[PDB]
Amino acid sequence: KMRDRLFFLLSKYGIRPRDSIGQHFLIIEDVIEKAIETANVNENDVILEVGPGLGFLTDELAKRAKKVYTIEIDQKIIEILKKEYSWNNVKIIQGDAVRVEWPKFNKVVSNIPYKISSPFTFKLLKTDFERAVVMYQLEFALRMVAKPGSRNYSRLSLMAQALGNVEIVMKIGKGAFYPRPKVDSALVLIEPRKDKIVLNENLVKALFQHRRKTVPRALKDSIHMLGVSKDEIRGIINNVPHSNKRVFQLYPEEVKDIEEYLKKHGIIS
Amino acid sequence: KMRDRLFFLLSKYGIRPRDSIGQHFLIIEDVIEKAIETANVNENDVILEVGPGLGFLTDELAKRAKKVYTIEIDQKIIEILKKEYSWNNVKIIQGDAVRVEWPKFNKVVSNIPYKISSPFTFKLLKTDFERAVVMYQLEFALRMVAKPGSRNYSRLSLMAQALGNVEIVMKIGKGAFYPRPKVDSALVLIEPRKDKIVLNENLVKALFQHRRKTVPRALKDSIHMLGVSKDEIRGIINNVPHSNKRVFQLYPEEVKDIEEYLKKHGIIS
Numbered sequence: 001k002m003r004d005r006l007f008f009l010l011s012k013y014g015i016r017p018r019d020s021i022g023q024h025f026l027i028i029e030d031v032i033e034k035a036i037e038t039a040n041v042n043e044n045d046v047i048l049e050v051g052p053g054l055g056f057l058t059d060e061l062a063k064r065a066k067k068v069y070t071i072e073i074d075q076k077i078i079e080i081l082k083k084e085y086s087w088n089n090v091k092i093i094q095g096d097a098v099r100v101e102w103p104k105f106n107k108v109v110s111n112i113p114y115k116i117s118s119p120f121t122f123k124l125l126k127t128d129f130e131r132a133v134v135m136y137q138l139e140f141a142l143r144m145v146a147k148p149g150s151r152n153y154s155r156l157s158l159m160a161q162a163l164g165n166v167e168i169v170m171k172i173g174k175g176a177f178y179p180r181p182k183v184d185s186a187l188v189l190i191e192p193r194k195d196k197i198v199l200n201e202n203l204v205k206a207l208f209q210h211r212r213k214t215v216p217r218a219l220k221d222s223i224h225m226l227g228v229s230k231d232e233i234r235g236i237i238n239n240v241p242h243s244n245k246r247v248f249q250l251y252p253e254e255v256k257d258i259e260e261y262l263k264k265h266g267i268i269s
Numbered sequence: 270k271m272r273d274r275l276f277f278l279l280s281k282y283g284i285r286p287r288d289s290i291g292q293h294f295l296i297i298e299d300v301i302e303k304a305i306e307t308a309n310v311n312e313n314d315v316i317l318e319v320g321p322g323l324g325f326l327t328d329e330l331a332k333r334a335k336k337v338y339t340i341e342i343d344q345k346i347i348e349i350l351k352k353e354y355s356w357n358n359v360k361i362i363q364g365d366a367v368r369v370e371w372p373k374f375n376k377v378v379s380n381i382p383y384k385i386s387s388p389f390t391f392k393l394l395k396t397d398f399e400r401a402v403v404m405y406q407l408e409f410a411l412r413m414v415a416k417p418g419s420r421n422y423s424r425l426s427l428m429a430q431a432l433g434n435v436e437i438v439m440k441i442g443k444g445a446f447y448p449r450p451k452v453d454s455a456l457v458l459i460e461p462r463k464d465k466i467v468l469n470e471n472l473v474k475a476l477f478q479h480r481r482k483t484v485p486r487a488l489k490d491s492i493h494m495l496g497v498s499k500d501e502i503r504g505i506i507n508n509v510p511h512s513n514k515r516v517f518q519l520y521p522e523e524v525k526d527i528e529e530y531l532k533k534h535g536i537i538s
């Protein structure tokens with residue numbers, strides 16, 4: 001039905017879904033409505049969307065929001081959106097959403113290109129926004145909610161828990177997109193944590209390079225590779241708090257204790 | 270002698286070398302002269318220096334260059350430089366050299382803070398410049414010149430070889446700095462490769478996450494963690510060129526073949 005509208009638009013502009021940048025388009029109308037009501041889009045909201053595709057999500061956002069900014073990398077899609085729709089309140093921004101400057105907004109509603117799930121999320125969590133409702137692959141959504149000390153707890157999980165309140169609203173079947181992905185997706189709600197734990201990105205990267213390591217092994221490994229000498233940092237690193245944990249068992253609070261200790265001992269400035 | 274001038278300035282402003290940001294100051298005058306003559310600093314040059322410290326290298330650059338930009342993170346040092354020197358042709362840039370916007374320049378001459386050796390180098394190699402003469406730790410300098418398939422060949426090595434012509438001019442003893450480091454340093458000369466191999470940063474990062482892996486194992490690992498499905502990329506990744514190598518054995522040219530193949534098959538856009 002919406003699938004049919006898609007097939008019509010695809011053949012009309014003689015374009016086929018290029019899995020290059022990411023082009024599994026959402027074609028179930030009620031998934032769109034559910035995303036939008038979950039974000040509570042109203043006449044006061046300024047929305048950011050990444051990857052409008054053929055504008056099915058965009059069109060519904062435009063009806064309810066004060067203003068939509070939508071970042072699209074593909075100039076052909078942009079031309080088609082402009083020809084196909086008449087919105088008063090949508091600003092299309094050409095570029096890679098990972099690279100371009102984001103406008104100010106209070107909400108995000110997006111079917112994210114799954115290839116930028118990871119950088120997109122880290123950028124978002126660094127933003128001031130009230131609420132984000134975003135579609136991801138299910139495994140990635142589950143990684144975002146992973147608990148310290150689970151197998152799939154990673155840098156993403158830590159930063160999500162440090163900076164956000166994250167919730168899987170529902171799973172979404174393969175059948176909801178064209179073309180079909182071979183894994184279920186998930187609709188995810190993110191709000192800023194009221195009591196954010198701001199962590200040093202270099203530290204986390206260093207620690208989570210190899211998240212299976214004990215925290216001492218990890219720390220010495222990562223700062224020696226920067227170009228430092230390890231004779232220089234052995235002792236200090238050795239007294240590091242939470243030293244009998246592996247990196248994948250660390251809570252944000254515990255990373256923060258490591259941070260402050262490293263700052264106190266000169267390691268991070 | 271220059272050591273003495275340092276002790277005088279240190280006690281005068283009541284500051285001690287803080288290994289926090291990095292403050293092993295160069296105190297042999299002939300190392301400075303050697304760095305400067307190796308870079309061939311002349312009245313036409315615009316020089317970038319990172320970490321002026323108490324301005325011993327800076328002052329020599331200033332008397333020979335058209336213009337010096339010098340990036341200093343520590344506001345106290347900046348105050349001292351401005352009181353202690355009367356330069357007409359030096360712009361001091363307050364900030365972390367890794368974070369701040371760089372000036373245009375044709376040469377770099379610097380005792381780099383060893384903590385930013387790695388990010389500094391990757392930024393530099395992406396710049397248009399005629400020549401850089403930079404002090405690093407010896408181990409890091411040796412990593413920069415490591416050969417494909419050696420133990421210490423890493424992302425740094427690959428990008429240096431892809432984008433630069435690199436040479437260790439000479440080793441520099443511990444005794445050349447105050448305070449003393451416990452490892453030798455090295456003066457390194459870098460020029461742009463005339464036929465640069467421009468590589469995709471994400472690809473290299475992905476490959477070199479775990480550089481001991483075969484190239485297939487590496488590729489599937491890194492793009493699945495971005496948030497994509499691996500059922501989606503198995504076949505394509507499987508036919509990838511140079512697949513019988515481990516990532517640490519790859520020449521820039523071989524990475525470029527991997528890049529082009531991945532672009533052709535939609536994986537990188």
Ligand SMILES: Nc1ncnc2c1ncn2[C@@H]1O[C@H](C[C@@H](N)CC[C@H](N)C(=O)O)[C@@H](O)[C@H]1O
Nearest residue numbers: 021022023024051053072073074096097113114
């Ligand atoms: N990095 C990017 N920045 C902005 N728009 C993008 C980017 N990558 C893909 N797009 C656009 O995203 C739209 C499709 C997405 N909304 C959904 C894609 C689907 N979830 C997938 O992962 O394949 C298309 O119009 C693409 O051109």
Ligand SMILES: Nc1ncnc2c1ncn2[C@@H]1O[C@H](C[C@@H](N)CC[C@H](N)C(=O)O)[C@@H](O)[C@H]1O
Nearest residue numbers: 290291292293320322341342365366381382383
């Ligand atoms: N990230 C940075 N950006 C700019 N200046 C810096 C940075 N880190 C340290 N500095 C300054 O760099 C100066 C020292 C460097 N030129 C030499 C440092 C020596 N190679 C070391 O690693 O200890 C000091 O004045 C520091 O304040």
Ligand SMILES: NC(=[NH2+])NCCC[C@H](N)C(=O)O
Nearest residue numbers: 037038039165167169189191
């Ligand atoms: N402010 C909040 N903590 N919101 C969370 C409630 C959102 C709710 N989980 C949903 O399904 O819509």
Ligand SMILES: NC(=[NH2+])NCCC[C@H](N)C(=O)O
Nearest residue numbers: 306307308434436438458460
């Ligand atoms: N254009 C070049 N590749 N020059 C390299 C010559 C620099 C020389 N290695 C030195 O010790 O000063």
Ligand SMILES: O=S([O-])[O-]
Nearest residue numbers: 229232293450451
């Ligand atoms: O400069 S490091 O050797 O302390």
Ligand SMILES: [Cl-]
Nearest residue numbers: 059060062063
């Ligand atoms: Cl409408």
Ligand SMILES: [Cl-]
Nearest residue numbers: 511512513514
């Ligand atoms: Cl090969």
Ligand SMILES: [Zn+2]
Nearest residue numbers: 019179180181
């Ligand atoms: Zn597909």
Ligand SMILES: [Zn+2]
Nearest residue numbers: 059085086087
């Ligand atoms: Zn409409």
Ligand SMILES: [Zn+2]
Nearest residue numbers: 241242245254
């Ligand atoms: Zn603990």
Ligand SMILES: [Zn+2]
Nearest residue numbers: 224225230408
């Ligand atoms: Zn080493």
Ligand SMILES: [Zn+2]
Nearest residue numbers: 139493494499
């Ligand atoms: Zn998996």
Ligand SMILES: [Zn+2]
Nearest residue numbers: 510511514523
């Ligand atoms: Zn090969």
